[PDB]
Structure 1
């Protein structure tokens, strides 16, 4: 087996969660859905209703 799995990228914004010991383990791309952009705007991973 010999594959490439190459994917291009575009300049976008990201919200990086920093857990204990300095690891990320979680991120939110604020360019795919309005929900992700809302999560990035308020700096939270759980959004309330409204």
Structure 2
């Protein structure tokens, strides 16, 4: 990543993990 030359940020890693979702009545994920 580059920034603008003249903050508690993360970087994580993804893995094939099973996950159970919870869609609401709006079609978005609430849990």
User: What band does the TM-score fall into relative to the shorter chain?
Assistant: 0.5 to 0.7
* Structure with more strand by fraction: 2
- Could you tell me the TM-score, scaled by structure 2's length? 0.54
Runs (4+) off by over 4 Å: none
Alignment deviations for residues 1-50 of structure 1 (CA, whole Å, 9 cap, x no partner):
x5651101111111011111101110xxxxxxxxxxxxxxxxxxxxxxxx
Paired positions, count: 25
- Could you tell me the TM-score, scaled by structure 1's length? 0.40
The unaligned stretches of length 5 or more in structure 1 are 27-50
